[PDB]
């Protein structure tokens with residue numbers, strides 16, 4: 513099984529909740545483990561060191577004090593290998609930041625509507641997915657600064673999209689939100705594939721035409737049958753889904769009946785098969801994420817009283833619970849380092865907790 517120890521803790525001076533944490537899984541052979549935190553109008557980088565040390569690297573303080581960053585996601589430059597950090601929040605502005613300098617190199621506006629989550633495509637580092645308060649999902653190409661596609665309408669989400677994930681190859685997305693529903697959006701169609709090819713052939717300095725985005729109004733599957741409240745986290749586990757609402761369970765399920773293939777599912781599909789549930793407590797509050805290590809061998813989720821749950825997914829039909837006496841605030845998000853040796857928890861009181869695998 514797995515064991516961890518609290519080697520360090522710190523607190524950011526703004527004292528506003530920290531809504532996001534991400535280790536850089538794109539970092540090179542030799543350089544140190546770096547993680548980013550988001551909360552208030554701040555983006556902060558941290559270097560993990562020996563003897564449980566958490567070294568401050570640099571901060572980005574947005575010019576707008578009314579900005580509230582809710583999410584971050586790392587990528588890299590496909591030509592140079594250099595890491596980049598995407599950040600967004602309440603203002604509905606995506607900012608692409610260079611971690612070496614904290615220079616905002618690129619900024620995107622889909623609308624002026626709050627962005628809840630950012631995800632990068634697992635196969636194309638340029639393809640950025642944003643989920644918004646305006647009930648839509650947006651797919652961006654950050655190499656050419658183009659809006660490839662808008663996912664939503666009457667048949668899309670009927671409320672705020674709180675989370676989304678790409679499958680293993682980035683052939684499809686599963687989004688979820690306040691409308692209690694989880695929706696599938698296929699992005700490997702002849703149409704989306706050509707839209708991505710075109711996004712790359714666009715240059716506004718060499719043409720008068722605008723970039724025409726795909727307007728996808730109909731999901732490929734939809735369900736309101738897994739949770740009976742706001743679904744605030746979703747993640748693919750192969751062809752299966754892990755999702756949670758505020759009902760003290762992470763649910764493992766799949767579209768259709770037990771033996772149905774996800775690629776054979778038609779949009780009209782009325783069934784869902786639940787495969788299991790990860791039960792816990794004191795996580796009845798909205799907006800609490802779960803996280804997985806690189807290998808998807810581990811599942812971590814923080815609760816509203818500062819307790820951190822960890823599960824081994826390699827078990828037959830097990831849990832472990834991480835507590836410290838000075839950790840009482842709600843853990844909004846957790847992040848495992850690429851080598852699964854460090855687990856970082858960020859809280860509502862702007863505190864950062866370091867758990868090392870022993």
Ligand SMILES: COc1cccc(C[C@H]2CCCNC2)c1
Nearest residue numbers: 531582628674744799800801844
């Ligand atoms: C940390 O967990 C989550 C889960 C879902 C969404 C978000 C962004 C929120 C911030 C609070 C108001 N709604 C948007 C955070």
